[PDB]
Structure formats: structure tokens, C-alpha cells
Amino acid sequence: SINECLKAMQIFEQLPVITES
Amino acid sequence: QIILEQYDVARKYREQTLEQDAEEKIARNSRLQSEIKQKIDLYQTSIVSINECLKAMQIFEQLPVITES
Amino acid sequence: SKIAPQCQNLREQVNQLIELLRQEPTLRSQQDTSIVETALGKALSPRF
Amino acid sequence: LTLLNQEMQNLGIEFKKYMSAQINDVVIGNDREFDQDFTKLKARMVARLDELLKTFSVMNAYKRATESHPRNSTAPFIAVLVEALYYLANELEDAFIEAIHELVKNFFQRLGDRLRKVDCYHQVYRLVGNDGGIEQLLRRAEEDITKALVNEARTECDRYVRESPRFYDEGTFSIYQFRQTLQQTSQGYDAQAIVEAEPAIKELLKLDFEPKVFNTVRKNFRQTVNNTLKTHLLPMAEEQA
Amino acid sequence: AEEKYPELFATLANDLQPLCIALRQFYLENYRQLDSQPREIAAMKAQE
Amino acid sequence: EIVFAGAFSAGKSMLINALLERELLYSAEGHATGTECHIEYANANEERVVLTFLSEAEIRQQALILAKYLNVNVGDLNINQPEAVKVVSQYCQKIIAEEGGENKSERAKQANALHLLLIGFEQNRERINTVQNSTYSMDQLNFSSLAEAAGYARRGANSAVLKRLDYFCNHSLLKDGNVLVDLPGIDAPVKEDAERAYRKIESPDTSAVICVLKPAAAGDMSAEETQLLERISKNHGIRDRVFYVFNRIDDTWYNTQLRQRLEGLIQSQFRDNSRVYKTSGLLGFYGSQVKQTNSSTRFGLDSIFATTIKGFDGEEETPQFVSEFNNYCANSGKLLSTAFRVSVNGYETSNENYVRILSEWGIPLVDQLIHDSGIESFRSGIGLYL
């Protein structure tokens, strides 16, 4: 949600987590 | 050396947002580019009238703008 | 004497350019329109 | 694919090593071809100086002086010295520029000819379909380097016009000898009796101009060429990598 | 009425050129500067 | 956070009033000493203000400094005694007569400044606390409206004893969360105040910096201004957030030599012209207020300038705005390319021409005057940047 909120104006993305395996 | 070997991974990682940045940036350039185009038209009309006014008596012409290309 | 239709609006035409020069923030350093102001005043309503 | 990326890095590292070695060898003078041209350049310049002053004639200097003043048809009887310095220096400068062009041109073509045999040049051309801009960058750098050297020569030869303390050596020549030719001795405005003093002034010029030339070529000119080549090439090579 | 009167307009134009000359130069530099940048998304994306 | 800086009595109070189209502050010459004011957005029904005062030690130190400059024999002058205040008042009145007026000379103004400061202290003796700066609101001091507080504050007696003001009004400019800050002049006698200004300016919390430069009128940069510019130019951390501004440009509209020097200076030093602005806050502020008047009040003479127009001898004095307005329409040449054909009659008084000119053309002339003022462009530029 934080990334989506900033997606509208700024491009500074955060670090997600996926496929820990 | 290792960090540079994963160049492809970063490209895939940020491919989700490069489209938006490029789309917005080109719009910014286009908006500003059209702004001056509007401004020069006003300048061109004004000086043309000035030259026509002086055309009746004096020959001292001004500098117009055309075919900027 | 030579009040031609072209000369009728010359008063406003010059003002148009002055505003454009003032609008440009960077070009205001070169601003020296005061000389043009005095010359235009003597052009209209001539005084000899 | 990842293995290929590693190989691309090595090509840049190898290219810089080869370019540095080639430039470094010239600095040490190990490159025999470059040395032959440089000594040839020095010999020509010294020979030009000796030949130019030995064939010097006072009348030609006087002829140049008159052209410099289109509104007059005579000379003050002293401008020959001034024109000699300008004529001597300007002619010397022209020789420097002409030879420098040849020196730079020969070096670059020899560098390019030998650069197409090493593996680094054709390993990349094997890997990709284009040269990678080596020729374009090499041509651009060569042109830029030539400009600097020409300025170096002109900015250094111009100082020769300034009279050296030896120029005012009364023993070798006294400027008041014109009184002998002028104190009721040259009744015609022909500037002919001045020719008798030609041998003396030639010695004065040799003493003044024999230095400031051997010092220049033998001491400073070599340093400028070596430093200029190294500083312009190395950053270009890094950019290419 | 025939010599001094027209001169007033003549000097006015001479005093207007110094500023009209600058406005044209400024606009062209900025306008031609933007044209250098690409327009297509594909070319722009590759640049990034 | 928006910060306005400049030398003492540089029109900073006048300039701030121009932007908001109101006289919330006072631009009296020689009186805005150390007055810091903050303005924030508030709902129409939530508008309010807060006030602050000085301490006795500072007042005595200022009185000592004022007496030190004025060389008055203040032997531990106890300003609490009406007798001593009257004696100093007679001395100040005596000095006014000798100098011919409070505003005639700088030394006269300082005598007047202490005259008003001591009187200002005498009129607000009850509200002063010995050490802590007394704090009150509109209700606590019984003030009913901001206009009452503004009128109360505008008075020289109250203004000289007010350390700080926190205004809360409803304005479109402040709606987005913009804060206006006024700082004491760096060239003030107190070195502590100057250090505070540099700390505030150098503080990263500040969002923008505004520099008011007198050389537009003086033609040369003063030592304090030179020190200020050297700090700004040599400071790479704030050089990207600077907006240079020149005030009182109207002085150069009729002076060729001053204009020529200023133009050369601008083209020589300030190459970053993208953030260089020219304006005259004095003309802009009054012009905005005049728009609220009409012919019924003689276009503000009966309502706005009724106090200034009143002369000591009974003859209607020409307000500085009116005097400049007549000069503006005559020699400035701004109207020289406008559709207007205003003419000045030498047989009519300044007020008579002022009434006649407005009665002929009216508001449209005022709009051109405000347009030529340049305040509108300045507000738009900073708003876009922020």
C-alpha cells in the first residue's frame, strides 16, 4: 500500500518480500 | 564483479515503473515546448504590425521570426 | 498629422513586448526599457 | 549470458593495459620509430636556423619594412632590425608547424596499423559487429592533440622577438655606426651604404638567437609532446572502455 | 515638419532593436534545445 | 517556512503588507526594531492572534543603548517615574524643535524612537513582566477583533513594546500551508539578534529565503549586505534555494545614473537570473487598498488617507502615495505606452489632480499600476516553486 500511494507521484520504491523458498 | 553480473535482474525489477517515468517525462517536455510556441506567435503578430506601421514612412525594418525548424 | 490606422494601436503593441521581457525571469537582468519608454513618449504627442 | 558479461569487462581492462604500455614506452624512448622522427625534427630545425641567418640579406628586410607602411616610401634606417626579428621568428615558427603536423600524423597511423593485429582489437570485433567507435574517437583525439601542440609552438616562438641582453652588445656591433654612413656620407635616400654593415649584424643575431632555440628544442619541447600525448589519450581510453 | 518629425520614429526603431534582438535569440535556443530530446517512448526508454 | 530578510527600515514590513493586501503590520520608519511576525491560514470563524512583550532588563538595555547613542544623562533612569519621563519627554520635544522634526535627521529619529519607546513603556506599564515575556490572546486582553488588535498594534507606543505576533487569517496563499516570517535586520545594534537571523537562515528547516537588497536605490553593496552575500554565495547548501529581490525600483524610473549602475551590477554579479525579481512594495500595497475605495470617499482620501491627508496648517498634505502617483503618471513613463492619456496640470494641487485623474479613468489605471508593480508575478513564482 505504501508503494502504491507513492506510485502516483514519486518513483522511489521500497523493498518487497516474495518467494522466500 | 558479482554486483555487475546481476544487471539483468535490476532491469526486470524496475521495468514495472520505467514506462510511467518515460510517459510522464515526455509529457513534461511537450507541455513546455508548446508553451513557447504559443508565446512566439504573440511576438510575431506584434512586430509585424510595428513594421507595417513604420512601412508607410520609414524603411527601418525589425527582425521577424519564421521557419524555426 | 500622419495619424494612420496602423499608428492607432502602436501604443498597445509596444506594451505587449515589454510584458514578455518582464515575464522571462532570466532576461530581466538585461532590462533597459527605460530608454525605449522616453523615446516612445516623444513619438506620440510630439513636442518640439 | 553471464559468462559473456564477464568477458566484456576483461576487454576493457586489457585495452587500457595495451594503450598505457604503448604510450609509456614512448615516454621512456624505447619506441625506436618515434625517436628517429624526433631527432630528425631537431636536426631540421637547427639546420634551418643556421641556413636562414647565413643567407640573410639586409635588403630583403628593408623591402619588408616598406610594405608595412603603405603610406610611405622610405624607412627610418632602423626598422631593418625590427623586421629581421619578425621575419626570422615568423619563418622559424612556420617550420615548426609544418614538421609537427607530419610527426603527429605518422605516429597515429603507425599506432593504428599495429593496433589491428593485437587480439584485443579483433576479439571485440569477433564478439560484436562494429568497431565500437575506436576510429571515430581516435580520429577526434588526433585532431584535438594537433591543436594544442601548434599553440605551444606559437606561444613559445613569439618570445624570440623580445630582444635579449646580448642584443645590446656594443662590442659586437654599435648602433651609432649609422652616423658614419649618415654624417655626410649617404647623400641619397637609397639605403645602399648600409649593406657594408651586414657581416657585423649577422654575428649579433647569431649570438642573440643561438640561445633561446637550443634551450627550447633540447630542454622543453620534448617534455611538452610527451605530457600532451599521455594526458589526452588515457582519459579517452577510459571513456572508450 | 519634414525632417525632424520622421526622425523621431527612426530613433524609436533603433532603440527597439537592442531588446527585440535578445528575445528572438533566447526563444530559439530554448526551442531548439528541446527538439534534441527524443519523442518516441521506445527511444526514451532505451536511454534510461 | 518563508523567510524575509533585509536591513533595518528597508520596507520589509511594508513589503509583507503588500503581499496580503492588508495592513496587518506597520511600516513606520525607525520603529520596526526586532519585530518578528508569523502568519498562518485559519478559517474565517477561527481567525485570531497572539502577542508577546519585552522585559525590563532588555528595555533598560535598549534605553541605555538609546541613551548611549543620544548621550542622555540616564543615571539609572527609572522609567517607572512619570517625573523623569516628562523630563526626558521635554528633552525629546526640545530636540525635536532643535532638529526641526522627528524625521528630519537620523539622530532626531532616535531621540523620537526613545521618546516613543519611553512613552510606549509608560502607556503599557501594567502588561509588562519583569523577566518572562508576557503572553496574552485577544480575549485575555479584552481585544474584540483583529482590527482592534491591528489598530492597537499599529500604534507606535504598542508596537515598540510587542516582541512577536502570531497572526491567523484566511487567505488563499496560506491555504496550502505557507508560513510568512519576518526577521530583524542583521545590521541591528544587538549582535545576539544578528546571530539568531543567521541561525534561522542557515537552519535546514527553512523552505525558502527572500533577500531584500537596498543597492537598487543606493547603487552599491553595504558591508553588512556584502557579508550577507558572501555567506550565501560561499554556502553551497542553500545556494539552490535563494530568490533575490530588489525593492523600491521606482527610484530608478526617473534617475538614469542609478539605473545604469544597477543594470551593470545585475549583469555582472547575478548570473542566476532565473530567481531575480524586481518590484516596489510601497506602490503595490497602497494601490491594493485604493481598490477598496471609490469616488464617494475621494478614492480613499476621506477614508484611507484621511489621516495622512490632514495637514498641520490645515492645508491638505499630499500623501507619499499621491505624490509618487503624480510623478509616476508624469515622468516614470510606464503609462507612456498605455491607452491612457493622463495629463498633469501645474495649476492644480496634488490632491486635485489625484481626484481628477481617478475620476477620469478610474480603476483600470490602478490595475495597470499594480500589473507594473510586479508583486503579482513574484507571488506566482514562489507559489509555483513551493
mmCIF file of C-alpha atoms in Angstrom, chain F residues 67-381:
data_model
loop_
_atom_site.group_PDB
_atom_site.id
_atom_site.type_symbol
_atom_site.label_atom_id
_atom_site.label_comp_id
_atom_site.label_asym_id
_atom_site.label_seq_id
_atom_site.Cartn_x
_atom_site.Cartn_y
_atom_site.Cartn_z
ATOM 1 C CA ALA F 67 20.554 56.972 25.733
ATOM 2 C CA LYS F 68 24.100 55.873 24.886
ATOM 3 C CA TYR F 69 23.533 56.891 21.265
ATOM 4 C CA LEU F 70 21.614 60.000 22.361
ATOM 5 C CA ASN F 71 24.165 60.771 25.117
ATOM 6 C CA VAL F 72 21.360 61.486 27.598
ATOM 7 C CA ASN F 73 22.421 61.513 31.260
ATOM 8 C CA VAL F 74 20.467 58.413 32.292
ATOM 9 C CA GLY F 75 21.741 57.822 35.814
ATOM 10 C CA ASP F 76 19.931 54.502 36.235
ATOM 11 C CA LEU F 77 16.865 56.212 34.783
ATOM 12 C CA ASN F 78 13.813 54.645 36.429
ATOM 13 C CA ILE F 79 11.255 54.857 33.613
ATOM 14 C CA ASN F 80 8.618 53.947 36.206
ATOM 15 C CA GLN F 81 8.644 57.560 37.454
ATOM 16 C CA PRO F 82 6.378 59.950 35.494
ATOM 17 C CA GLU F 83 8.552 62.891 36.571
ATOM 18 C CA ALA F 84 11.659 61.513 34.858
ATOM 19 C CA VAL F 85 9.619 60.504 31.802
ATOM 20 C CA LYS F 86 8.273 64.049 31.491
ATOM 21 C CA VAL F 87 11.793 65.465 31.867
ATOM 22 C CA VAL F 88 13.022 63.178 29.091
ATOM 23 C CA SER F 89 9.874 63.999 27.111
ATOM 24 C CA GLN F 90 10.685 67.708 27.354
ATOM 25 C CA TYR F 91 14.254 66.931 26.285
ATOM 26 C CA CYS F 92 12.978 64.905 23.326
ATOM 27 C CA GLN F 93 10.485 67.642 22.440
ATOM 28 C CA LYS F 94 13.316 70.155 22.836
ATOM 29 C CA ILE F 95 15.476 68.072 20.491
ATOM 30 C CA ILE F 96 12.594 67.861 18.004
ATOM 31 C CA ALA F 97 12.379 71.657 17.912
ATOM 32 C CA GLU F 98 16.159 71.951 17.537
ATOM 33 C CA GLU F 99 16.186 69.357 14.745
ATOM 34 C CA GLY F 100 13.007 70.790 13.201
ATOM 35 C CA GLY F 101 11.203 67.441 13.276
ATOM 36 C CA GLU F 102 11.444 63.783 14.256
ATOM 37 C CA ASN F 103 12.083 62.589 10.684
ATOM 38 C CA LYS F 104 14.492 65.386 9.716
ATOM 39 C CA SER F 105 17.669 63.602 10.848
ATOM 40 C CA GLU F 106 18.697 60.134 11.975
ATOM 41 C CA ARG F 107 19.701 61.454 15.401
ATOM 42 C CA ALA F 108 16.304 63.153 15.656
ATOM 43 C CA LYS F 109 14.538 59.882 14.827
ATOM 44 C CA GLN F 110 16.472 58.002 17.515
ATOM 45 C CA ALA F 111 15.528 60.703 20.025
ATOM 46 C CA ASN F 112 11.951 60.248 18.821
ATOM 47 C CA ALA F 113 12.396 56.467 18.977
ATOM 48 C CA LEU F 114 13.384 56.635 22.644
ATOM 49 C CA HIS F 115 10.710 59.302 23.123
ATOM 50 C CA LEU F 116 8.097 56.874 21.801
ATOM 51 C CA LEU F 117 9.723 53.866 23.486
ATOM 52 C CA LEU F 118 9.672 55.517 26.914
ATOM 53 C CA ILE F 119 6.142 56.770 26.246
ATOM 54 C CA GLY F 120 5.315 53.348 24.829
ATOM 55 C CA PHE F 121 6.545 51.759 28.046
ATOM 56 C CA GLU F 122 4.597 54.321 30.081
ATOM 57 C CA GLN F 123 1.352 53.503 28.250
ATOM 58 C CA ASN F 124 1.800 49.719 28.717
ATOM 59 C CA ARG F 125 3.332 49.540 32.194
ATOM 60 C CA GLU F 126 0.756 47.097 33.582
ATOM 61 C CA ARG F 127 1.161 44.386 30.927
ATOM 62 C CA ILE F 128 4.972 44.202 31.232
ATOM 63 C CA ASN F 129 6.542 41.365 33.220
ATOM 64 C CA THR F 130 9.970 41.716 34.797
ATOM 65 C CA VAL F 131 11.596 38.624 33.257
ATOM 66 C CA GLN F 132 9.178 36.371 31.387
ATOM 67 C CA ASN F 133 7.683 37.744 28.175
ATOM 68 C CA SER F 134 4.026 38.372 28.997
ATOM 69 C CA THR F 135 1.719 36.328 26.759
ATOM 70 C CA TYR F 136 -1.929 37.150 26.074
ATOM 71 C CA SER F 137 -4.628 36.474 23.486
ATOM 72 C CA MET F 138 -7.434 38.603 22.078
ATOM 73 C CA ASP F 139 -9.844 37.538 24.832
ATOM 74 C CA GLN F 140 -7.288 37.813 27.646
ATOM 75 C CA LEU F 141 -6.543 41.463 26.806
ATOM 76 C CA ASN F 142 -10.252 42.079 26.006
ATOM 77 C CA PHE F 143 -9.483 42.765 22.335
ATOM 78 C CA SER F 144 -12.652 42.061 20.358
ATOM 79 C CA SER F 145 -11.321 41.784 16.792
ATOM 80 C CA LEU F 146 -8.087 41.582 14.830
ATOM 81 C CA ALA F 147 -8.759 45.094 13.520
ATOM 82 C CA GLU F 148 -8.832 46.328 17.120
ATOM 83 C CA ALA F 149 -5.603 44.429 17.784
ATOM 84 C CA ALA F 150 -4.164 45.686 14.491
ATOM 85 C CA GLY F 151 -5.124 49.255 15.351
ATOM 86 C CA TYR F 152 -3.778 48.711 18.858
ATOM 87 C CA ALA F 153 -0.575 47.186 17.474
ATOM 88 C CA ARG F 154 -0.139 49.698 14.639
ATOM 89 C CA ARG F 155 0.297 52.434 17.253
ATOM 90 C CA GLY F 156 3.951 53.264 17.808
ATOM 91 C CA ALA F 157 3.559 53.061 21.582
ATOM 92 C CA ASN F 158 2.271 49.480 21.485
ATOM 93 C CA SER F 159 4.382 48.328 18.531
ATOM 94 C CA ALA F 160 7.682 49.208 20.217
ATOM 95 C CA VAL F 161 6.728 47.003 23.200
ATOM 96 C CA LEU F 162 5.469 43.991 21.193
ATOM 97 C CA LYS F 163 8.170 41.357 20.711
ATOM 98 C CA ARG F 164 6.261 38.994 18.417
ATOM 99 C CA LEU F 165 2.867 38.497 16.785
ATOM 100 C CA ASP F 166 1.251 35.266 15.560
ATOM 101 C CA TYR F 167 -1.471 36.172 13.062
ATOM 102 C CA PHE F 168 -4.136 33.675 11.968
ATOM 103 C CA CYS F 169 -6.205 34.751 8.952
ATOM 104 C CA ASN F 170 -7.983 33.229 5.951
ATOM 105 C CA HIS F 171 -6.065 33.714 2.697
ATOM 106 C CA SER F 172 -5.731 31.606 -0.441
ATOM 107 C CA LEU F 173 -1.935 31.950 -0.405
ATOM 108 C CA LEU F 174 -1.670 30.455 3.094
ATOM 109 C CA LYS F 175 -4.292 27.749 2.478
ATOM 110 C CA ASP F 176 -1.703 25.229 1.245
ATOM 111 C CA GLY F 177 0.261 25.621 4.494
ATOM 112 C CA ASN F 178 2.557 28.575 3.801
ATOM 113 C CA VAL F 179 4.216 30.417 6.701
ATOM 114 C CA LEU F 180 5.473 34.004 6.417
ATOM 115 C CA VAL F 181 8.371 35.021 8.672
ATOM 116 C CA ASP F 182 9.945 38.446 9.233
ATOM 117 C CA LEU F 183 13.402 38.645 10.805
ATOM 118 C CA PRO F 184 15.218 41.581 12.447
ATOM 119 C CA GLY F 185 17.742 43.435 10.342
ATOM 120 C CA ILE F 186 21.213 41.921 10.531
ATOM 121 C CA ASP F 187 22.657 45.445 10.841
ATOM 122 C CA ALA F 188 20.827 45.971 14.147
ATOM 123 C CA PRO F 189 22.919 47.195 17.104
ATOM 124 C CA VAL F 190 22.369 43.935 19.012
ATOM 125 C CA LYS F 191 24.827 41.256 17.904
ATOM 126 C CA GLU F 192 22.742 38.500 19.512
ATOM 127 C CA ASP F 193 19.807 39.257 17.206
ATOM 128 C CA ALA F 194 22.064 39.076 14.144
ATOM 129 C CA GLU F 195 23.331 35.637 15.177
ATOM 130 C CA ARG F 196 19.727 34.458 15.519
ATOM 131 C CA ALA F 197 18.940 35.536 11.953
ATOM 132 C CA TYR F 198 21.917 33.654 10.509
ATOM 133 C CA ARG F 199 20.994 30.561 12.525
ATOM 134 C CA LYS F 200 17.399 30.764 11.286
ATOM 135 C CA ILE F 201 18.504 31.334 7.683
ATOM 136 C CA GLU F 202 21.133 28.583 7.826
ATOM 137 C CA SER F 203 18.648 26.257 9.536
ATOM 138 C CA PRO F 204 17.666 23.464 7.100
ATOM 139 C CA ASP F 205 14.083 23.722 8.382
ATOM 140 C CA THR F 206 13.573 26.880 6.316
ATOM 141 C CA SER F 207 11.902 26.146 2.981
ATOM 142 C CA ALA F 208 12.720 29.383 1.132
ATOM 143 C CA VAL F 209 14.821 32.520 1.573
ATOM 144 C CA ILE F 210 13.996 36.048 0.384
ATOM 145 C CA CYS F 211 16.729 38.705 0.220
ATOM 146 C CA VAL F 212 15.784 42.390 0.034
ATOM 147 C CA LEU F 213 18.649 44.437 -1.416
ATOM 148 C CA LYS F 214 18.916 48.218 -0.983
ATOM 149 C CA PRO F 215 21.657 48.695 -3.650
ATOM 150 C CA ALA F 216 18.777 49.004 -6.114
ATOM 151 C CA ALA F 217 18.480 52.521 -4.648
ATOM 152 C CA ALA F 218 21.913 53.034 -3.062
ATOM 153 C CA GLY F 219 23.779 51.641 -6.078
ATOM 154 C CA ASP F 220 26.441 49.841 -4.022
ATOM 155 C CA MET F 221 26.507 46.900 -1.631
ATOM 156 C CA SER F 222 26.977 47.734 2.045
ATOM 157 C CA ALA F 223 29.341 45.911 4.388
ATOM 158 C CA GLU F 224 26.501 44.020 6.079
ATOM 159 C CA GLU F 225 24.950 43.213 2.697
ATOM 160 C CA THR F 226 28.386 42.216 1.400
ATOM 161 C CA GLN F 227 28.776 39.956 4.434
ATOM 162 C CA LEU F 228 25.310 38.504 3.809
ATOM 163 C CA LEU F 229 26.013 37.819 0.130
ATOM 164 C CA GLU F 230 29.411 36.283 0.899
ATOM 165 C CA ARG F 231 27.763 33.878 3.348
ATOM 166 C CA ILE F 232 25.070 32.952 0.817
ATOM 167 C CA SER F 233 27.447 32.637 -2.139
ATOM 168 C CA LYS F 234 30.030 30.686 -0.124
ATOM 169 C CA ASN F 235 27.304 28.429 1.348
ATOM 170 C CA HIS F 236 26.687 25.641 -1.155
ATOM 171 C CA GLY F 237 23.934 24.103 0.984
ATOM 172 C CA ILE F 238 21.406 26.911 0.433
ATOM 173 C CA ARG F 239 22.571 28.421 -2.864
ATOM 174 C CA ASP F 240 19.902 26.347 -4.655
ATOM 175 C CA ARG F 241 17.072 27.852 -2.552
ATOM 176 C CA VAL F 242 17.654 31.605 -2.950
ATOM 177 C CA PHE F 243 15.326 34.162 -4.560
ATOM 178 C CA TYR F 244 16.985 37.576 -4.835
ATOM 179 C CA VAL F 245 14.575 40.520 -4.817
ATOM 180 C CA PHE F 246 15.105 44.252 -5.338
ATOM 181 C CA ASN F 247 12.643 46.688 -3.758
ATOM 182 C CA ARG F 248 11.858 50.369 -4.329
ATOM 183 C CA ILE F 249 12.781 50.174 -8.011
ATOM 184 C CA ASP F 250 10.606 53.260 -8.557
ATOM 185 C CA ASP F 251 13.573 55.407 -7.505
ATOM 186 C CA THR F 252 15.367 54.427 -10.731
ATOM 187 C CA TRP F 253 12.388 55.157 -13.009
ATOM 188 C CA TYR F 254 13.473 58.828 -13.144
ATOM 189 C CA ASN F 255 17.233 58.529 -12.460
ATOM 190 C CA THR F 256 19.437 57.481 -15.372
ATOM 191 C CA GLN F 257 22.708 57.177 -13.448
ATOM 192 C CA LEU F 258 21.280 54.939 -10.719
ATOM 193 C CA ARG F 259 19.517 52.738 -13.276
ATOM 194 C CA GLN F 260 22.685 52.372 -15.358
ATOM 195 C CA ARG F 261 24.750 51.297 -12.344
ATOM 196 C CA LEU F 262 22.075 48.843 -11.191
ATOM 197 C CA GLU F 263 21.762 47.281 -14.649
ATOM 198 C CA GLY F 264 25.524 46.808 -14.876
ATOM 199 C CA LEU F 265 25.662 45.256 -11.411
ATOM 200 C CA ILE F 266 22.882 42.780 -12.230
ATOM 201 C CA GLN F 267 24.540 41.711 -15.487
ATOM 202 C CA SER F 268 27.893 41.312 -13.694
ATOM 203 C CA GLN F 269 27.160 39.534 -10.395
ATOM 204 C CA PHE F 270 23.799 37.725 -10.557
ATOM 205 C CA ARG F 271 24.131 35.351 -13.492
ATOM 206 C CA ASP F 272 21.451 33.127 -11.929
ATOM 207 C CA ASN F 273 18.734 35.490 -13.166
ATOM 208 C CA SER F 274 16.002 32.820 -13.095
ATOM 209 C CA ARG F 275 15.274 33.810 -9.467
ATOM 210 C CA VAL F 276 15.839 37.584 -9.671
ATOM 211 C CA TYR F 277 12.742 39.761 -9.305
ATOM 212 C CA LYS F 278 12.033 43.496 -9.360
ATOM 213 C CA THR F 279 9.151 45.170 -7.534
ATOM 214 C CA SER F 280 8.120 48.207 -5.474
ATOM 215 C CA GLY F 281 6.103 47.122 -2.450
ATOM 216 C CA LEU F 282 5.254 50.692 -1.454
ATOM 217 C CA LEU F 283 3.217 51.325 -4.606
ATOM 218 C CA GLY F 284 1.653 47.861 -4.635
ATOM 219 C CA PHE F 285 0.361 47.933 -1.061
ATOM 220 C CA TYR F 286 -1.408 51.291 -1.308
ATOM 221 C CA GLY F 287 -2.754 50.515 -4.779
ATOM 222 C CA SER F 288 -4.424 47.378 -3.435
ATOM 223 C CA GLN F 289 -6.074 49.335 -0.614
ATOM 224 C CA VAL F 290 -7.229 52.063 -3.010
ATOM 225 C CA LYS F 291 -9.195 49.423 -4.932
ATOM 226 C CA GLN F 292 -11.445 49.177 -1.851
ATOM 227 C CA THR F 293 -12.394 52.875 -2.141
ATOM 228 C CA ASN F 294 -14.421 54.913 -4.628
ATOM 229 C CA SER F 295 -15.286 58.472 -5.618
ATOM 230 C CA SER F 296 -17.588 58.875 -2.606
ATOM 231 C CA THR F 297 -14.582 58.854 -0.251
ATOM 232 C CA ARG F 298 -12.469 60.781 -2.798
ATOM 233 C CA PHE F 299 -10.881 57.426 -3.685
ATOM 234 C CA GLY F 300 -9.638 56.852 -0.143
ATOM 235 C CA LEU F 301 -8.779 60.433 0.813
ATOM 236 C CA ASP F 302 -11.855 60.666 3.056
ATOM 237 C CA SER F 303 -11.487 57.074 4.325
ATOM 238 C CA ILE F 304 -7.975 55.665 3.816
ATOM 239 C CA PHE F 305 -5.745 58.753 3.559
ATOM 240 C CA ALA F 306 -7.958 60.917 5.795
ATOM 241 C CA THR F 307 -5.212 60.781 8.433
ATOM 242 C CA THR F 308 -2.264 61.327 6.082
ATOM 243 C CA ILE F 309 -4.080 63.981 4.035
ATOM 244 C CA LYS F 310 -4.692 66.044 7.189
ATOM 245 C CA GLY F 311 -2.072 68.782 7.375
ATOM 246 C CA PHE F 312 -0.806 70.625 10.428
ATOM 247 C CA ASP F 313 -1.598 74.040 8.917
ATOM 248 C CA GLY F 314 -4.996 72.866 7.632
ATOM 249 C CA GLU F 315 -3.915 72.538 4.001
ATOM 250 C CA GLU F 316 -4.397 69.012 2.668
ATOM 251 C CA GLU F 317 -0.920 67.481 2.615
ATOM 252 C CA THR F 318 -0.032 65.231 -0.302
ATOM 253 C CA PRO F 319 0.313 61.581 0.798
ATOM 254 C CA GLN F 320 3.530 59.894 -0.280
ATOM 255 C CA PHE F 321 1.410 57.553 -2.402
ATOM 256 C CA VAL F 322 -0.291 60.506 -4.103
ATOM 257 C CA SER F 323 2.991 62.360 -4.643
ATOM 258 C CA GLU F 324 4.572 59.276 -6.210
ATOM 259 C CA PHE F 325 1.385 58.603 -8.186
ATOM 260 C CA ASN F 326 1.554 62.036 -9.825
ATOM 261 C CA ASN F 327 5.262 61.552 -10.529
ATOM 262 C CA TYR F 328 4.535 58.026 -11.765
ATOM 263 C CA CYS F 329 1.996 59.315 -14.293
ATOM 264 C CA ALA F 330 4.287 62.187 -15.359
ATOM 265 C CA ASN F 331 7.946 61.118 -15.552
ATOM 266 C CA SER F 332 8.040 57.353 -14.930
ATOM 267 C CA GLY F 333 6.822 56.576 -18.450
ATOM 268 C CA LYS F 334 5.005 53.356 -17.544
ATOM 269 C CA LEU F 335 1.764 54.862 -18.876
ATOM 270 C CA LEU F 336 3.742 56.165 -21.874
ATOM 271 C CA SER F 337 2.742 53.043 -23.858
ATOM 272 C CA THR F 338 -0.758 52.586 -22.384
ATOM 273 C CA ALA F 339 -4.134 53.551 -23.811
ATOM 274 C CA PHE F 340 -4.346 56.224 -21.104
ATOM 275 C CA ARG F 341 -3.530 59.856 -21.937
ATOM 276 C CA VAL F 342 -3.233 61.233 -18.413
ATOM 277 C CA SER F 343 -2.070 64.850 -18.215
ATOM 278 C CA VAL F 344 -0.806 66.731 -15.156
ATOM 279 C CA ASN F 345 -1.894 70.324 -14.517
ATOM 280 C CA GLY F 346 0.618 72.532 -12.719
ATOM 281 C CA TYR F 347 -2.108 74.903 -11.508
ATOM 282 C CA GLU F 348 -3.896 72.140 -9.560
ATOM 283 C CA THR F 349 -2.741 70.700 -6.256
ATOM 284 C CA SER F 350 -1.536 67.114 -5.976
ATOM 285 C CA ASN F 351 -4.827 66.057 -4.384
ATOM 286 C CA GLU F 352 -6.869 67.905 -7.018
ATOM 287 C CA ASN F 353 -5.030 66.084 -9.806
ATOM 288 C CA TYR F 354 -5.310 62.850 -7.811
ATOM 289 C CA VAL F 355 -9.097 63.215 -7.651
ATOM 290 C CA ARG F 356 -9.344 64.474 -11.237
ATOM 291 C CA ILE F 357 -7.225 61.685 -12.735
ATOM 292 C CA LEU F 358 -9.130 58.910 -10.959
ATOM 293 C CA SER F 359 -12.494 60.483 -11.791
ATOM 294 C CA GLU F 360 -11.481 60.464 -15.467
ATOM 295 C CA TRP F 361 -10.066 56.940 -15.906
ATOM 296 C CA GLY F 362 -10.704 55.117 -12.627
ATOM 297 C CA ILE F 363 -9.932 51.542 -11.614
ATOM 298 C CA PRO F 364 -8.445 50.409 -14.975
ATOM 299 C CA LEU F 365 -5.484 52.743 -14.433
ATOM 300 C CA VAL F 366 -4.964 51.199 -10.986
ATOM 301 C CA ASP F 367 -4.946 47.684 -12.449
ATOM 302 C CA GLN F 368 -2.161 48.686 -14.841
ATOM 303 C CA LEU F 369 -0.241 50.228 -11.933
ATOM 304 C CA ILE F 370 -0.497 47.011 -9.916
ATOM 305 C CA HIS F 371 0.400 44.985 -13.010
ATOM 306 C CA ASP F 372 3.530 47.106 -13.473
ATOM 307 C CA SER F 373 4.296 46.771 -9.751
ATOM 308 C CA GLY F 374 5.363 43.153 -10.256
ATOM 309 C CA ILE F 375 4.060 41.837 -6.928
ATOM 310 C CA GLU F 376 1.615 39.531 -8.721
ATOM 311 C CA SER F 377 4.401 37.810 -10.663
ATOM 312 C CA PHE F 378 6.517 37.417 -7.520
ATOM 313 C CA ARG F 379 3.707 35.693 -5.616
ATOM 314 C CA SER F 380 3.008 33.361 -8.542
ATOM 315 C CA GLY F 381 6.687 32.475 -8.897
#
